[PDB]
Symmetry: D2
Subunit: 121 residues, 4 copies
């Protein structure tokens, strides 16, 4: 819990997430997706709540990735919100929101929602 977040994680789609959790709640790393208008690693930044409760709970965290890198600009950003749980098999369970930049005309259809489970396997 708290700790253990640092490392390389993978989700059901094959995307890889490499993060560093800092003593004071920062989350920094890079994201390589398996889907979308993605081509390479993207920078990610987030926060995690460094003093989780001392009961059998997971650690809340969230992060963002703007899908723009030296290779692609998909004019969109994804944020994942979820919680980290450790143990023999640690995972991060998240729900995400992906918003694309649209014209007002298409604003009603700008956000996709999904879920992802990351493991270090």
């Amino acid at each position: 819990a708290e700790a253990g977040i640092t490392g390389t994680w993978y989700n059901q789609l094959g995307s890889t997430f490499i993060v560093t959790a800092g003593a004071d709640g920062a989350l920094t790393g890079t994201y390589e997706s398996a889907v979308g208008n993605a081509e390479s690693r993207y920078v990610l930044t987030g926060r995690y709540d460094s003093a989780p409760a001392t009961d059998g709970s997971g650690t809340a965290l969230g992060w963002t990735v703007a899908w723009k890198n030296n290779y692609r600009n998909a004019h969109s950003a994804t944020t994942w919100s979820g919680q980290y749980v450790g143990g023999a098999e640690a995972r991060i369970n998240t729900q995400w929101l992906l918003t694309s930049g649209t014209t007002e005309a298409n604003a009603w259809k700008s956000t996709l929602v999904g879920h992802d489970t990351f493991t270090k396997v």
Copy 2:
């Protein structure tokens, strides 16, 4: 545009968002919330997509706030996903997810969803 996003913003609940959009697509600042087990400012970090399109599309962005500071710890974190629309009345329209740390058993009810609109006042 980074500038365009930089500034002080408020939403309909009365929360304050102070942000700096940096060259490299980063977003840093503090969030003051009007609701929840919150007290004072909290640090936020996000990213925004620095090269939007010409046209009249919004700039997609997103940021996270873990509700822990030196005064409180709510054991939860919210991420806001949305777009910035500039003009005379610049607005950031978002959808957010708030997750609380829970035991595996109550995990099914760990995330809330909602939407917020922010109006800019200062740079």
Copy 3:
């Protein structure tokens, strides 16, 4: 209250919702949308929780619309989840999920989320 919900309602996009709240907690009616691969009325079915609280809480409800009628088929369905707030200006505030049928491969991008507010005009 069933009555209270029964009526003609419009949201900010210009879509029409005609509903009948029945005794047994059911919701039946037609939806006319202003956006999407939609043409004409579609059938909706939902439920609402017939015994709310006294107090000034909203009545939780929800309904589904599969976007297929005799004129079009969009292979998608939307569910709206929210609450009814009565008074002189009765409103139904919702959050919706729109899922499109896709291949397993593009399933990750099958659902859109958003929010709608409905204003009542007729019973």
Copy 4:
């Protein structure tokens, strides 16, 4: 696809869903949950899109359950949106919204979001 929706399904939590899909898009049945202020079966009603595409896609559908029965009234309603996919192992993959009736003061925190995968196993 289209067909096959009728039957008894179960989700990862143990909730049971029994539905009847009608030739014209109606979904009717009852829901027995494993979690919440639930006590027994609840009536559910929904719709499904009866003419799915003739390509390897799933069938879109959605349904609602107001958590009020002769035994409990949890002043809330849940709607599930997702798609049915058949094959040797058929499943219904959904994302749900659960709204409780609150005072305006608490309206900002009235909706929970999650996901559920139902199988006939």
